[PDB]
Amino acid sequence: STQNRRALDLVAAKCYYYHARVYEFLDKLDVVRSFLHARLRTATLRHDADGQATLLNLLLRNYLHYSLYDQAEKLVSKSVFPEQANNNEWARYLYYTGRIKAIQLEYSEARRTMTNALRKAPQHTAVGFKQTVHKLLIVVELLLGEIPDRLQFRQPSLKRSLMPYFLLTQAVRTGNLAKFNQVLDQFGEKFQADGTYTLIIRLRHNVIKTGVRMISLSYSRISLADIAQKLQLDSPEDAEFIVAKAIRDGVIEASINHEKGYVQSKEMIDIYSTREPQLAFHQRISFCLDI
Amino acid sequence: MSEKKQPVDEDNWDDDNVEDDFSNQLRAELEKHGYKMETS
Amino acid sequence: MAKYYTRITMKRMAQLLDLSVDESEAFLSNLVVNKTIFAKVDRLAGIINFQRPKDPNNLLNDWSQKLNSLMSLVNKTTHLIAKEEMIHNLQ
Amino acid sequence: QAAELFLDTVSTFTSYELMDYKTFVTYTVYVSMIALERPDLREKVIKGAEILEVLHSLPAVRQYLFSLYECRYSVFFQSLAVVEQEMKKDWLFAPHYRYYVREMRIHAYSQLLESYRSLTLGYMAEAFGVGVEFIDQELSRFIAAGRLHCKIDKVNEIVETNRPDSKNWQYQETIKKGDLLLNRVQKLSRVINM
Amino acid sequence: TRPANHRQLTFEEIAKSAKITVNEVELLVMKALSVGLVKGSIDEVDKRVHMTWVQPRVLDLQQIKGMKDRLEFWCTDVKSMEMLVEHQAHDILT
Amino acid sequence: DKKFHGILDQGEGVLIIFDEPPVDKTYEAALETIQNMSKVVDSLYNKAKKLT
Amino acid sequence: IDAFRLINANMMVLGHEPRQTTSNLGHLNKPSIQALIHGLNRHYYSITINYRKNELEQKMLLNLHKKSWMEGLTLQDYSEHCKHNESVVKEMLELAKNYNKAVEEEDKMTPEQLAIKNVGKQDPKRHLEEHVDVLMTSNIVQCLAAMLDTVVFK
Amino acid sequence: AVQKVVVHPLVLLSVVDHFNRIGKVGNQKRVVGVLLGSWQKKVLDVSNSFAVPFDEDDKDDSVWFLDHDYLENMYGMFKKVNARERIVGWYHTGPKLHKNDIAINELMKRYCPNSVLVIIDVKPKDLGLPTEAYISVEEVHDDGTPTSKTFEHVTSEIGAEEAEEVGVEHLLRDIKDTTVGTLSQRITNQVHGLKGLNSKLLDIRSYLEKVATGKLPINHQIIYQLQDVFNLLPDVSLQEFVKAFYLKTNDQMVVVYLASLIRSVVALHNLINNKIANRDAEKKEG
């Protein structure tokens, strides 16, 4: 009750960043972790404010950057909620766990805690971590399909940090295949410097599903020995095969005349008499009643 | 104000979508029509 | 034929008028420009039809009418059964 | 709006900034051929005595506007190449010269396509603009862009149209603005009250 | 006899069940509509009729068994949908 | 010229004729409210954002 | 109400105050000044009353007065409900244009002055939250009742 | 011939007070009285009443008595105090429709032509409106007797009046779920109205108790309606009744999406009118 834990949990947290950057320069990292667990062990039992919060972001800061287990642990960590963390350590808290679901393939759940990690942030200008989340937030949306205009707040310090990465999503909204490869040699070295390359390498599945939606919506009765030459696939024998998983995933619906070679598609109009715009309402009806 | 504790480190929008379309497709599409009349 | 039919062929109606199929089309021309009988005829499959609009809203509207006819009818028998027991097992 | 502010062209005097009134005539006709359809181009700028005689001194713009109205589709692109080049070197249209023609292409395409339903794709080469595969790559990128309501076939060599209602497309622009305004107010309510 | 799912008989079945030719069954049903014993519509190109309303007849103690049983599971359907009402809108009104 | 509407065919010349007053009152007279209310929230910068 | 009863004017000549208060139950109601102009309290007096209510009457007038029979199990003129759903929204646009107006003349003359001065012409802010209640209960009641008829009626 | 009846809460209370003043007999007494009122514009009105002396012995229950001298002079007084008021018919207390009420009506039809009866409740428990009325119709018809006559229920409700709504709403003071918003309809007809259809479904089950075992008259004129209810049972979900349903859901909820969007910005503006009275008040006052 003297706030000796409370006022010095900040002094714990604020010295840890100097305790880290010394150790992230010339020293080790890992017996501080076991010291941090006992520091976490004494938390939440005696006092239950701002000791549950900072001791977990400072637990994550190299556990992400290591391959140690530490990610399903943070699932079964009860300390996910400290419920209040002073609006700046809380705001990046959703970011450090935001990359966790991204790096282990949890796509759609991650983009809402990436967005919430972006809009709880202060009014500063030299913001190089905000330079990172604005990059990472729409990596995972390229994995899903949606893409906003990223340069909608472009700065004299944001512009040079976007031009390789903005040129990346130039290729995704197109249907070309080696255009992705024209990026992945021109800016392959920059993507490792930001530490994102293992996410970038799997976009070839998303380019071709964007392409097959574009082609099936453009052309109605197209030969399967024509789509491969347009996608520079170099082979018609697997041009049936991507379309096979395109119906297995359910991108396009209609049939293939494999004996002839043309892929017909039905003109599916009047989605107006279907339940699905009410789902676009019911997500947004209830939310605007919440605000 | 304006702190952000650092742990780590119109006129523009419509043409960007138009830059997306003809990014590498027929920028100065001016003279091929003079050369497509005798072919097509 | 507009009252009781839904969709009849061109050849059938011209036979029930005992005249030419062209003379049958001239009869329905100057009656729907009078708009006293509405029709949507055809001269490729001979398929004419009577009182066939798009009906965007009249589906649910006539359905809602069938509820109020039904709910008035379930109220008709409900207060009628209870008196019928009162003339057999009264006292 | 700019054709609506340039609606009059009568009391618009021989001013200082467009020192030729005929330059003002060229600007008000270039914005009119986007902003309004043809129940209104067939009454307002084709019949105005104030607008007919001032481009009677112009051989270029008279041929450029009327080719869309006279359905002279092939010669339409010839002067469209002239205007768009002139639009580049001109000030104040050069911020948006690439946005103009791609709206004038899609307006010249769909005007021809909404007349018929079973128009083959090899008819538009010799009557509308040469290059069959040029038409192919151009129509493929606009249907995929979500406009120009038709549906092209490939191996029986035909272009089919459809007709959608003004419900799905009218619903589409609503969900953009509803997301945009809620993006505005949710970000606002975080900023105020800490 | 037909249930309320279709009750959509064809003219060939009338030509089977009344052994009368094709060129008279249209005259037969317009008489039936005029007297008022049936209320339905008449197609001619698909050769079917959409009968909707029929004249009510009498029945013995066996057809009430069908009207007992088709009524009986319709009772609990009023129970089942209203069960959502007083359980979900319960705190809206005590 | 939209004085009549339908479609024209080239193989044989069939004029499919159809008509519907589709809807116009419900949506676009409700759509401009959104761009009106956009200007209201912009005016809320002129009494709150500059102020508090 | 407030039944009365006379007092003797013989005691008025004596100057003697009647009715000899033994309980703090009489002086609970205050008489009106217009009745005090008349003979109260110089010729008559008030009497406190209550009412004799009983469950033999209480329940059989509550559950019988306003009972809606099958009204909410209707659809309310199904072509015109969505027609009335535009009969409000159209002027609700321009009433929001007033709300796109009245907020813009704030940070101005001290909105206590914006209380006196707005008694001539209509305001958006109260009128604009008015129709939202109307455009909700007309919709939510009618949309819910349509989706209970589909289950119960087959 | 008669549209409906209109019953005021005065006469509703003007029976129960008489049921209490005869409730001391203990054994058996039905409250039978004279119903006063008018009927104008084809709508039956009920305004006033009283009760007439009446007894009934159980053996040979066809001997009733109406002291008509008590019927004459008291109506002679009520016509004198109110010439607008007149006779409208009669009533009885009606637990279970006693037997004399086939010819009580024919005894006193020489005053009112359409001499209507009213059945009331003395023990109030139901989920409806416990006020019943019939009408007198006779028939030289189908099968029963050469002289046949059976009452038919005309619809019944409690009508209001401006003067009595002061007194009616004064005597309640218990509960009154007013403020009709989004949830008055939810309970007056969506909680209750679905359970309204309960006892209407359950009523034809009570007639269904005669499948082979119940009372001896079987149907003849009861089943033409029941044959129609299963026939006029509504349209199944295969047609554009599917499609036009999603059509209006995609239309009605648009207005709900707009209106809810408005409600946020209004209360957001009301937040700014409360930060104008917080930060601009602490520096001034303290």
From Swiss-Prot, chain A:
GO cellular component: a single term: extracellular region
Spell out the protein name for this chain: 26S proteasome non-ATPase regulatory subunit 3
> Which key words are in the record?
Isopeptide bond, Phosphoprotein, Proteasome, Ubl conjugation
What range of the intact protein is shown? 196 to 486 of 534
**BP terms from Gene Ontology:** proteasome-mediated ubiquitin-dependent protein catabolic process; regulation of protein catabolic process; ubiquitin-dependent protein catabolic process
Q: Any idea which residues bear Phosphoserine here?
A: 223, 235
Record keywords: rRNA-binding included?
no
* Record's subunit section: Component of the 19S proteasome regulatory particle complex. The 26S proteasome consists of a 20S core particle (CP) and two 19S regulatory subunits (RP). The regulatory particle is made of a lid composed of 9 subunits including PSMD3, a base containing 6 ATPases and few additional components. Interacts with UBQLN1 (via ubiquitin-like domain). Interacts with ERCC6.
UniProt family annotation: Belongs to the proteasome subunit S3 family.
Give the source's domain of life in one word. Answer: Eukaryota
Species annotation:
Homo sapiens
Q: What does this protein do?
A: Component of the 26S proteasome, a multiprotein complex involved in the ATP-dependent degradation of ubiquitinated proteins. This complex plays a key role in the maintenance of protein homeostasis by removing misfolded or damaged proteins, which could impair cellular functions, and by removing proteins whose functions are no longer required. Therefore, the proteasome participates in numerous cellular processes, including cell cycle progression, apoptosis, or DNA damage repair.
- State the gene name recorded for this protein: PSMD3
Question: What Gene Ontology molecular-function terms does this entry list?
Answer: enzyme regulator activity
UniProtKB/Swiss-Prot annotation, chain C:
Query: What does the protein in this record do?
Result: Component of the 26S proteasome, a multiprotein complex involved in the ATP-dependent degradation of ubiquitinated proteins. This complex plays a key role in the maintenance of protein homeostasis by removing misfolded or damaged proteins, which could impair cellular functions, and by removing proteins whose functions are no longer required. Therefore, the proteasome participates in numerous cellular processes, including cell cycle progression, apoptosis, or DNA damage repair.
Specify the protein name.
26S proteasome non-ATPase regulatory subunit 12
Oligomer and partners:
Component of the 19S proteasome regulatory particle complex. The 26S proteasome consists of a 20S core particle (CP) and two 19S regulatory subunits (RP). The regulatory particle is made of a lid composed of 9 subunits including PSMD12, a base containing 6 ATPases and few additional components. Interacts with ERCC6.
**What family classification does the UniProt entry report for this protein?**
Belongs to the proteasome subunit p55 family.
- What pathology is it implicated in? Stankiewicz-Isidor syndrome: A neurodevelopmental disorder characterized by delayed psychomotor development, intellectual disability, behavioral disorders, mild dysmorphism, ophthalmologic anomalies, feeding difficulties, deafness, and variable congenital malformations of the cardiac and/or urogenital systems.
Q: Which residues carry this modification: N6-acetyllysine?
A: 3
What's the superkingdom here? Eukaryota
Bilayer-crossing residues are: none
From Swiss-Prot, chain D:
Segments forming domain PCI: 1-166
Biological function = Component of the 26S proteasome, a multiprotein complex involved in the ATP-dependent degradation of ubiquitinated proteins. This complex plays a key role in the maintenance of protein homeostasis by removing misfolded or damaged proteins, which could impair cellular functions, and by removing proteins whose functions are no longer required. Therefore, the proteasome participates in numerous cellular processes, including cell cycle progression, apoptosis, or DNA damage repair.
Describe its partners and assembly state: Component of the 19S proteasome regulatory particle complex. The 26S proteasome consists of a 20S core particle (CP) and two 19S regulatory subunits (RP). The regulatory particle is made of a lid composed of 9 subunits including PSMD6, a base containing 6 ATPases and few additional components.
Homology family? Belongs to the proteasome subunit S10 family.
Could you identify this protein by its name?
26S proteasome non-ATPase regulatory subunit 6
- What does the organism's lineage look like at the top? Eukaryota, Metazoa, Chordata, Craniata, Vertebrata
Q: Which residues of the full protein are shown?
A: 196 to 389 of 389
Swiss-Prot record, chain G:
Identification of the protein by name: 26S proteasome non-ATPase regulatory subunit 14
| One MF term in the entry's GO annotations | endopeptidase activator activity
Instruction: Determine if Zinc is one of this entry's keywords.
Output: yes
Q: Which domain of life is it from?
A: Eukaryota
One record GO biological process = proteasome-mediated ubiquitin-dependent protein catabolic process
Cellular component terms, GO, for this chain's entry? cytosol; cytosolic proteasome complex; extracellular region; ficolin-1-rich granule lumen; nucleoplasm; nucleus; proteasome accessory complex; proteasome complex
Q: What's its job? A: Component of the 26S proteasome, a multiprotein complex involved in the ATP-dependent degradation of ubiquitinated proteins. This complex plays a key role in the maintenance of protein homeostasis by removing misfolded or damaged proteins, which could impair cellular functions, and by removing proteins whose functions are no longer required. Therefore, the proteasome participates in numerous cellular processes, including cell cycle progression, apoptosis, or DNA damage repair.
> Which tissues carry this protein?
Widely expressed. Highest levels in heart and skeletal muscle.
Which positions carry the signal peptide feature in this UniProt record? Answer: none
Q: Which organism is it from?
A: Homo sapiens (Human)
Tell me the residues on which Phosphoserine occurs. Answer: 68
